[PDB]
Amino acid sequence: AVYKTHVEKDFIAFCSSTPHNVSWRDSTMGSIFITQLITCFQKYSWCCHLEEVFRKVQQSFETPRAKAQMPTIERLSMTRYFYLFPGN
Amino acid sequence: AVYKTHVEKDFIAFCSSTPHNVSWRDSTMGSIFITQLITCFQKYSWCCHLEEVFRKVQQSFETPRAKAQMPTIERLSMTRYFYLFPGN
Amino acid sequence: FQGLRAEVETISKELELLDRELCQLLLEGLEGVLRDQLALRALEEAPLDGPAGAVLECLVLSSGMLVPELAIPVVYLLGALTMLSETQHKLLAEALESQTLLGPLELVGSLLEQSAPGEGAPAWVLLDECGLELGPHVCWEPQAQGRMCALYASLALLSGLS
Amino acid sequence: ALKLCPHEEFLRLCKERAEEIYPIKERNNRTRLALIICNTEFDHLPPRNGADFDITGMKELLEGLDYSVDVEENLTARDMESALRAFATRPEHKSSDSTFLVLMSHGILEGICGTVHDEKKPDVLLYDTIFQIFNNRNCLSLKDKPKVIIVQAARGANRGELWVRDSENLEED
Amino acid sequence: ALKLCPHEEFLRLCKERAEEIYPIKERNNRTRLALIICNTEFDHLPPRNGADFDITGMKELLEGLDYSVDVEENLTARDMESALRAFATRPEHKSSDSTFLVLMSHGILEGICGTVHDEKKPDVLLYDTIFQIFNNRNCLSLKDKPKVIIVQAARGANRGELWVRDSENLEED
């Protein structure tokens, strides 16, 4: 049989910086974006879905310690919440 | 004194269709996207923030009857959740 | 020619929306319908199996009902294929299996544009089955216009699935 | 109808989710503004009949959310840009906490079409122009405040449907 | 360390939010795959020094999330595209429920730069190319499954800071 579906669906992109803007990375520490993303995943993955974790990342980027950057979400096609359930 | 802030922040765009795709509109009923968004706001504004309401919209667009559409979120710069609190 | 190309693109654009696996199963079924004209004569009366049975499985639902958004493009392709002979049909599937539909489609489009009104060459074979005088040879006889226009649609629709 | 949030849950959320939610101005001393742009009639494009239903619906909805709704209809790219910069410069946003931008017209991937748009004569407002207008450089009264841009413009001529193995009374924007 | 969700809440959440969350395949019979692309050395750009620590961090994180992590480094735009279609065609996604695509390089608003990128000689993979690769037409094994694209490439190169009335030893991507 054949049924109807969408072409694009369930997409989510997390970019390190707003459009037309610079993303930062430290030689000794790697990149601030990845470092914060890993920290937020370690702390909030067991109780917050992927999108909620991305907010915790952006919350950490409100006030700018030194360099100022804001990770943005784009082409969000998800129709459901994606809980990772670490350990399951 | 003067302090640092971001150039772009607290933005959120809700488009009626995925990129490269068509949005539909009925002469007698208006547009499917706006009708569903208005219905989700009437039903979920008092308890769900703006982004959670947009998910309820996309859930209503998951399985497609006849023509298929998926509203997408783009350039999401919000660092907090925006509750509208209708009536307050 | 411009109105003909637009009439072709109005269906070629709607056949790009068919799935990749569905395009391959449709291409496989049509290449099978080639060998057996028993499947061709049953389109006007139209579960079944075989080459046309495989094509039938591409355009039906769980209840077996036709999808008009997908059946009409197939009806238009078969309508342009009925104006051609079985020799042209078999040479078209030869170009299908070789997966080199860019050359002949480009030449037919370049000819079709100019005409506003050799031996051992498939194109010549193709043009000899159309009804042209072969031997440049810009001389064009209008008695083969419809089959060439149908050939162009028979070429571009397949490139829309390529 | 639009359901309302009880006073209890509003204040409980403000207590237990203070740093996670956007602040709200006092209902007594608040001036929330929203803007709607909708092009319905064109000279070279099919008419977007029925959009009036969407205009009133969004306007009434935003009014239920306590927003003063400005309406602009049938504008060129220049007029749309001018209307957006005029809305961004209005001083009531200093006493506001958020804003809504409801755009309804034909469009492409790059942006939204005007009234006199054509393939040979492109009249298009870019999406990037909107973010450029309302960023923290050009609009300072909406700093650290939510900015919701709800658009309805088709971004391509291709349908967004496929077919996988196992009504119709609407126009296209 | 990565804290884990107890089995009880996993089962309760799937029970009380069935229609609202994405389904999960059983961990015993699951083949979650993740992909990392990271360009560190270039011919016309400084190198993304320390990137590997980001590489190892992302790999260990995805392994803690029960993902088999494949790693690719220093590819051209053609090589990056070819690797992506190869990852999209891998059959383990039929037995998976999600996927991750981690890309680290310099990039432009349009996409992400390769190793041999230059202003006059652009070697760039477009974001739209990625969505074309993994959409429901080209990739059918990831239908109705989450697709997470985590990138780090500035798309404009103009600092993103302002100044409003009222360490530093890092290079820029």
From Swiss-Prot, chain C:
Consequence recorded when altering residue 76 to D: Spontaneous pyroptosis-inducing activity
Effect the entry attributes to changing residue 80 to D: Spontaneous pyroptosis-inducing activity
Annotated site residues (Cleavage) in this chain: 4-5
Residue list for modification S-(2-succinyl)cysteine: 23, 149
Subcellular compartments: Cytoplasm, Cytosol
Official protein name in the record: Gasdermin-D, C-terminal
Upper taxonomic lineage: Eukaryota, Metazoa, Chordata, Craniata, Vertebrata
Portion of the parent chain present: 287 to 480 of 484
UniProtKB/Swiss-Prot annotation, chains D, E:
Reported impact of residue 163 to L/N: Abolished interaction with Gasdermin-D (GSDMD) and ability to mediate its cleavage. Abolished binding to IL18 and ability to mediate its cleavage
Annotated catalytic residues: 106, 154
Effect of residue 157 to D: Abolished ability to cleave IL18
Domain of life the protein comes from: Eukaryota
Subunit and partners: Heterotetramer that consists of two anti-parallel arranged heterodimers, each one formed by a 20 kDa (Caspase-4 subunit p20) and a 10 kDa (Caspase-4 subunit p10) subunit.
Name the record gives this protein: Caspase-4 subunit p20
Organism for this UniProt entry: Homo sapiens (Human)
Residues of the full protein shown: 105 to 289 of 377
